[PDB]
């Protein structure tokens, strides 16, 4: 009620690095709010336009055994990997679709407590490791906040381990708006999932410990009203009353390869929009 529209126009795609090196890798990440729902809402139209080298999907609500046939309409992303909850049901779930097969694909974070909900794919390539995640939400009434804190610690420790061997790119729906600039209404959301001090602090801990840089915020440190999620309710997207929940976090060693980190605000299909990373690897 207190918010009207706030403008955001994502800047043009910067496709060369500081060294002048053209981008060699384009990664698109997207919380699809259910793979079938997303397909019905023309989600694949953006994927075809974007033509990424790697597509990471969160909240697929689908196991590798029950995938929709339409995913065959992406022949340029022929190597497809899927994780889903162990109970074999339609919730959570992540996907990674790639032009080239990774050297190795793994699922989860090496901890039984945290590996039952199909939340993480690890894809190792020659020069870097890619992780895509759908981080557990703290829940309505914060009923899952204690668990989320345990998740955060385990995930941080796991990523620090990976980064000790190869440069890391982490992408996906991290279910937190880091700072006040990362959501439209910080004042009214400090007791809500995604903007609790515990969640924000966890994100800060992750950046420091691994370490990782927030690609978007690194490039655009002072840019407001840049969001990746809007509630389906109450004209939130039309008013740009949103949250930045979706990130590409990078090892510091990859910052010289960083060309751009995009937010595809106008792309429909979900309550999140896609985000896209350009790297000159």
Distance of closest approach, residue 193 Cβ to Mg ion, in angstroms: 12
Question: Looking at 173, 182, 214, 260, which residue is catalytic?
Answer: 173
- In terms of CB distance, is 137 or 196 closer to Mg ion? 137
Question: Looking at 114, 214, 227, 272, which residue is catalytic?
Answer: 272
Distance of closest approach, residue 271 Cβ to Mg ion, in angstroms: 6
Distance of closest approach, residue 272 Cβ to Mg ion, in angstroms: 8
Residue nearest to Mg ion (CB): 33
- In terms of CB distance, is 38 or 81 closer to Mg ion? 38
Q: What is the dihedral of CA 231, 237, 242, 246, to 10 degrees?
A: 80
Question: Looking at 81, 134, 227, 247, which residue is catalytic?
Answer: 134
Verify whether residue 114 is a known catalytic residue.
no
Tell me: is residue 271 an annotated ligand-binding position.
Answer: yes
Verify whether residue 173 is a known catalytic residue.
yes
- In terms of CB distance, is 58 or 276 closer to Mg ion? 58
Tell me: is residue 173 an annotated ligand-binding position.
Answer: yes
- In terms of CB distance, is 33 or 214 closer to Mg ion? 33
Tell me: is residue 153 an annotated ligand-binding position.
Answer: no
- Interacting residues with Mg ion (CB under 5 A): 33
Tell me: is residue 272 an annotated ligand-binding position.
Answer: yes
Are 94 and 83 spatial neighbours (Cβ–Cβ below 8 Å)?
A: yes
Distance of closest approach, residue 134 Cβ to Mg ion, in angstroms: 10
Verify whether residue 134 is a known catalytic residue.
yes
Tell me: is residue 185 an annotated ligand-binding position.
Answer: no
Q: Known catalytic residues? A: 134, 173, 272
Q: Which residues fall in the annotated binding site for Mg(2+)?
A: 31, 59, 173, 175, 271-272
């Amino acid at each position: 009620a207190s918010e009207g529209p706030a403008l955001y126009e994502d800047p043009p795609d910067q496709k060369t690095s500081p060294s002048g090196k053209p981008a060699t890798l384009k990664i698109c990440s997207w919380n699809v709010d259910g793979l079938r729902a997303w397909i019905k809402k023309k989600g694949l139209d953006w994927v075809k336009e974007e033509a990424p080298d790697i597509l990471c999907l969160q909240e697929t609500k689908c196991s590798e055994n029950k995938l929709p046939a339409e995913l065959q309409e992406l022949p340029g992303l022929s190597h497809q990997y899927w994780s889903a909850p162990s109970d074999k049901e339609g919730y959570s779930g992540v996907g990674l679709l790639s032009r080239q097969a990774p050297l190795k694909v793994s699922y989860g974070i090496g901890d039984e407590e945290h590996d039952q909900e199909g939340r993480v794919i690890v894809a190792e390539f020659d020069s870097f490791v890619l992780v895509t995640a759908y981080v557990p939400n703290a829940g309505r009434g914060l009923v899952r906040l204690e668990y989320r804190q345990r998740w955060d610690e385990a995930f941080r420790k796991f990523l620090k381990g990976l980064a000790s061997r190869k440069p890391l790119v982490l992408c996906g729906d991290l279910n937190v708006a880091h700072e006040e600039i990362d959501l439209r209404n910080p004042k009214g959301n400090k007791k809500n999932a995604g903007f609790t001090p515990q969640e924000r602090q966890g994100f800060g801990e992750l950046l420091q410990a691994v370490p990782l840089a927030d690609s978007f915020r690194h490039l655009y440190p002072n840019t407001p009203y840049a969001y990746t999620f809007w509630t389906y309710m109450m004209n939130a997207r039309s008013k740009n009353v949103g949250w930045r929940l979706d990130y590409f976090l990078l090892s510091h060693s990859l910052l010289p390869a960083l060309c751009d980190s995009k937010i595809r605000s106008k792309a429909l299909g979900s309550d999140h929009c896609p985000i896209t990373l350009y790297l000159a690897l």
